[PDB]
């Protein structure tokens, strides 16, 4: 059941912003590892004396990488005269975030009909304000409220290309990489206590809840279920230590756990990413045993052929199934030094009407299926 | 004239250590951009709860990338019980360095006969101590003194594979990249005042001085002139603003300006690096006008053929000449967000006896030749 209770009009995920120590090196690594194109910049070469921000795109997916310059370059500025293109940016906040958490997501940005309205309604309904609405060049409005930990939910609305003050990058420096990633499917937070986190976020958004090893989790969703925000809490005392708890320890508390990126062809995406794992790209979790793929015939043999299943086996892809649809997924190793944030690659099969959001679930059935396949492979 | 006045026995450059916010992403970017192999690690997976350190190698060149973990992971440790593999590391120093300077070189490390002796003699002769000698697993001794700004000169000596506590990286995660880079030729500092900097460093090392647009510079060299440490100061009031002064402003003071990496085949190195510039690697300075390469015939037509000169032209390579030998060189754009540190690729022709250090100079003749070629190309 979907009560469609959004307190303001939400459209889609807009962008994800990483706060970095050096935006250049993270953005170049991610571009190569994920097959994302450099598409916009705001830095010294565009007159920004405050922060360096670089935008990567793949389809509708937008990854922004931002780092602070020396405060000395902008010491004469005040907020009315700022050269920052993202007015919510603050040197001290950014340095403290990265010191505390390491490389990670600062902002989960969603496009809304009216960012000022979304902000006011959010705070009237319990949201902790982070940055008030600011209109950029009379064209785009941006506002921020706290989501969890030091992560903000950023509202963006357009009257009528990324943000004012960003320049399109020169074609020569913009190599058209593309491994098939097309949009952000969901963005997942880890928190110490799920209940209060859910109550807080669902409280100010009106997002509704969507449809024994490590965690409890729930998913908040917008009206059409295209903005999907799962949240995890640890389960303590378990045989193996909870990966949610490890996250909280190494991250210094709550924050974004993983970004799930939808591919239009997960087999091409994983072939291309795995070719680059050892030459600057991303590594993937250790593959499941062959028993997992043997057992896929009984589970999804009506959705995937033998060839398509064998192709899952060579690439380490996981498969889970809903009552609505089927999900192919795989997880990277952590994106940076700490065992904190990672990426999921996903493709969904079914739920055609366009495809409805969350088709096939989030792979929670793969916890049981993995452990069983582990012991079954012990044989 | 070479008075051979080293106050202790110096062998060769050993490694360069970058202090990072996220060592993983910088190391992966550099590995791909420069064709360096992942060869050792010290991080959580090796029991280091303090810092993440990753070592890249190409020939004898060793680049180390280090970033701090949360201090909470090691809060119970004291120096006698540390899990850090580099005992001079300090969370606060590293965070303050990166906050102040951004991504850059913390340590210029040279191998010496006896790091304890080198340290004591250095400080007895004016060196400002940074980290006292520490013996690692009764096998390697490390000590540090201040060089300039927040850069240290690190002494390493071996009784008899990088450092104790570092593990060799798994072959699968160790792709054998190689674009021809073979060793560190020289490491260059920018300072506000050259005289005091030279007096200080030559004072404690016994290094001797080796053989109108922007700077004054001089080069300190070890006995056999294989450890080469140029230092630049700005020249103010010039028509174009000094790039040394821009460095000091954006770096928050003195620091390492560039690393010159010798290639065994500069044409292969530059072909391979330029193929990767727009897909995660490094960008190069804008190429000289065709007049520069037209004028190369008269200057080096006895060293390079027409084909070898035309090959310089397509790759943007610069050529300068000594009375001893000839130098091919090219400069990258800055390695990170700030217009501070960059890399030079070099290959030297001549001075055979082995090749003697500094053969061909450092390209200072290319300041005049570039400006002339600029106006000549205006035509
Ligand atoms: C537990 C674990 C340890 C070491 C590496 C990997 C894992 N690991 C996962 O992290 C994992 C995740 C993260 C999801 C997942 O995407 C997801 C949930 O965890 C909760 C609902 C929302 C959501 O999107 C699904 C299955 C997973 N499975 C099966 C798994 O094994
Ligand atoms: C001035 C400038 C502005 C924008 C980009 C590039 C440049 N630029 C250089 O940075 C440059 C350098 C850095 C060297 C060089 O390697 C060097 C010295 O500068 C002093 C002696 C020790 C040493 O190693 C030589 C020639 C150079 N030339 C010719 C040049 O044009
Ligand atoms: Co997921
Ligand atoms: Co040089």
From Swiss-Prot, chains A, B:
Pathway: Amino-acid degradation; L-phenylalanine degradation; acetoacetate and fumarate from L-phenylalanine: step 3/6; Cofactor biosynthesis; prenylquinone biosynthesis. Its EC number is 1.13.11.27. Keywords: Cytoplasm, Dioxygenase, Iron, Metal-binding, Oxidoreductase, Phenylalanine catabolism, Repeat, Tyrosine catabolism. Residues 12-158, 183-333 form the VOC domain. Signal peptide: none annotated. Fe cation binds at residues 186, 258, 344. Pfam families: Glyoxalase (PF00903). GO terms for cellular component: cytoplasm. Disulfide bonds: none annotated. Binds 1 Fe cation per subunit. It catalyses: 3-(4-hydroxyphenyl)pyruvate + O2 = homogentisate + CO2. InterPro entries: 4OHPhenylPyrv_dOase, 4OHPhenylPyrv_dOase_C, 4OHPhenylPyrv_dOase_N, Glyas_Bleomycin-R_OHBP_Dase, Glyas_Fos-R_dOase_dom, VOC. It is an enzyme of class 1 (oxidoreductase). Belongs to the 4HPPD family. PANTHER family: 4-HYDROXYPHENYLPYRUVATE DIOXYGENASE (PTHR11959:SF1). Homodimer. This is 4-hydroxyphenylpyruvate dioxygenase.
